[PDB]
Amino acid sequence: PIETVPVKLKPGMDGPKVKQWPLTEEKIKALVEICTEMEKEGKISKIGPENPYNTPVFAIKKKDSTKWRKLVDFRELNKRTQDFWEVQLGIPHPAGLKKKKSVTVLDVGDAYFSVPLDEDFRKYTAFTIPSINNETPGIRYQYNVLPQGWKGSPAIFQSSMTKILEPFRKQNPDIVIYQYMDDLYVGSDLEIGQHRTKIEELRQHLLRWGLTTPDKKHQKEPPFLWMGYELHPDKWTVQPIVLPEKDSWTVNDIQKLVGKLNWASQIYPGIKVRQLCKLLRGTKALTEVIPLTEEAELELAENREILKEPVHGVYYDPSKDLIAEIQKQGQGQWTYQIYQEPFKNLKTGKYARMRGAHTNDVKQLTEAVQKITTESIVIWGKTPKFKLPIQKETWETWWTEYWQATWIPEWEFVNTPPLVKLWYQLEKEPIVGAETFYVDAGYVTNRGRQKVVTLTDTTNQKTELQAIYLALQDSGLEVNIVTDSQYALGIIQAQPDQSESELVNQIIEQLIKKEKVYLAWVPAH
């Protein structure tokens, strides 16, 4: 049988002592029968009036079925049971799989029941079945195996399974098994019949420890509709996305759509949601109907196109390098796709995350690179060779300049417009000949120029950039600007090309225009 995992209650706390809710005499009977079957098979065992502990038990009918089912409430117990390592949350992404000749998944029967429970804990699983007659038994039992609905059942169960599987796996390196709750997904490049054979070795091997599996004639095989994607032994896509042809769009509708849209991006390249995504501005209620904008309609229609033809992602070929390519799908938007074979997509994807109020393509593209690397390390345990629309000369320039340190893996330039570039650079030295503006809301130049202004609804910082702006404004092709705002300085010294603040974006505009610009900082008073 399986070796028991020692369980304990959280420190200080004691076992659960809960009163059994009242029960229907009809149920009282139904249970006694269910709890006899269990006692007979050994899954549970009648205990003595010694054990104070006790959790309530309920009776329900199998959804759309006519009979009785036992349901024990362990909430209190679970609040008293130590924390376990606990199952994984992260599931395998399709693109990480290697193609298998054949695959079949098995549903494990009464797995939790086919697993023992640490005796020193068995008591804590105590419950009672009220006796019909006013003065009669009202028998108490306690679990012997893993209780469905109990905190540590999954972990232990899975854990146990891994132990059971160990051997088989060992002598069948060709086979690849994936544990997922009460399902075993098995894949192999074995020839059809040979496959179906090991599947029989397994099933038995499982039966060895009471683990029952479903019978071939009623098992489950591809296509495998798994967590959002449709999995074939050769390729993979997302489960077909149908865009509603609604006439009246509401706020949930959109939010819902936008969400489903995002989903696709991981494989359907070119999907765009911006136009939809500014249909949500100022919205007042989850039920507000928003009439679609022209570009939104343009977008929706355009997305329907991409969704119309099913596309596919292929599997990971551990024999070939991974290749990564990025393009600028627009301001803030970057698209990328990973393939091993020339455009043989394993996965695709977008990147619109703006890290900070201000940024430039170089910085952002790098961040995109970083995002991908991370992702890749997780899916294929290795970093891809990048193909970027930026020249080393361009990169390495901004590189050195920046205060933060950064590093992009082995990467190759790809002359595929648009190309990321720096629209401007601050002069490293003050300019000889250029006018010199001393900005503080106004400025004063070495050439007599002045322009003190006042305004409405401003921020202290906002006023500072304002000045600089005016300076760029009224200046010629080459300017030397001097300021005391260390804030404005940091921003511009970053040489951003994009920002949320329109103001900034204007200044940026000025800068791209100038021939030469020297920005200098000076002390307070």
Next chain:
Amino acid sequence: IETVPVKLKPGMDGPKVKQWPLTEEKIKALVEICTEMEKEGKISKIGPENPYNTPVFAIKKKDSTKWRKLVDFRELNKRTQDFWEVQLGIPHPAGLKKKKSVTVLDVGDAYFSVPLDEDFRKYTAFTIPSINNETPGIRYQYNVLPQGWKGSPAIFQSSMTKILEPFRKQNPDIVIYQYMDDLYVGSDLEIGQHRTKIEELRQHLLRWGGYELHPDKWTVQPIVLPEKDSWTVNDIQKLVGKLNWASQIYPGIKVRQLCKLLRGTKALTEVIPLTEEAELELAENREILKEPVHGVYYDPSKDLIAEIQKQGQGQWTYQIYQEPFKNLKTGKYARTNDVKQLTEAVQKITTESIVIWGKTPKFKLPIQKETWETWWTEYWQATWIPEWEFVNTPPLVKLWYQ
């Protein structure tokens, strides 16, 4: 054979740290190593009853094709009780930091001998991760004294001095300091004569079962002012700004005569001759900067902070202080890529801290967590791990250091 009952600080519980994604290569490496450590009963697979976790990493050794398992017990150590290391608890030899040359040895393996208190074992839990989550992940916990845990060098201390008192007695001309898994050996002998005495210890250590630092040649890179032919308004300006910032440290810095050259909205490039009056001010400030601010003493009860700046072209700068502006040391580092470099500086700076004060400082790194977390293990070689934090450097600061 008996195990000294170790305990976490009061109320404290075990670490449940996340395990950063590791590359295939690394995992394999860890899989081989651990499989071995298992055979030798050093570690053991654990059940789900154990909810604790410590990050593990694989790093390559300097001048060796072999891989080394690096466990990040940073948190565990953090919540591990203290040990009476006051009374005969080493502590720290002021002599070492000047003993000419010093070599660092990894004695981690020495720990594998001593068994670890069973009740404490569960906290050493760690996991070898798997790609794309195909499988559960190999789980283990240490049975022996684990390399990297602060409890190890302590418990072993006893037996450790035991094994060293002889060599000490033999070569009292040699300073021998232990830190976690490292052994700092200092001496003034000549190189050839040094590397030899080291090997004598290399083998004297085997009797029971590769760096090259030069402590004496370290110096406090101070703040410096430009010294140029002619001085344009800009120069003055920058000059004054820097001066203004430094004044908060060295109060004797006057800028009066310098700011008077700035009266007026002149053109940035206009050359300003220095009026003798001012010329002396510079001269003075210039002389006040020739040395670290007086009265900056180290406090053992306070955290030792470290800030690095990317100076550019492969040049970095740092400062070690506990209290703002009150720098204990200040230095620079010159070379690759930003990260490799950064990790090098880091390791170097830590080493010094250890050697000098006997503690790893807390670094404030000018990088992005994701990046650091991605490549740091690629070039890291130390056996300890300082605590770090990531920050954005303000443009002016980097300026004031060069």
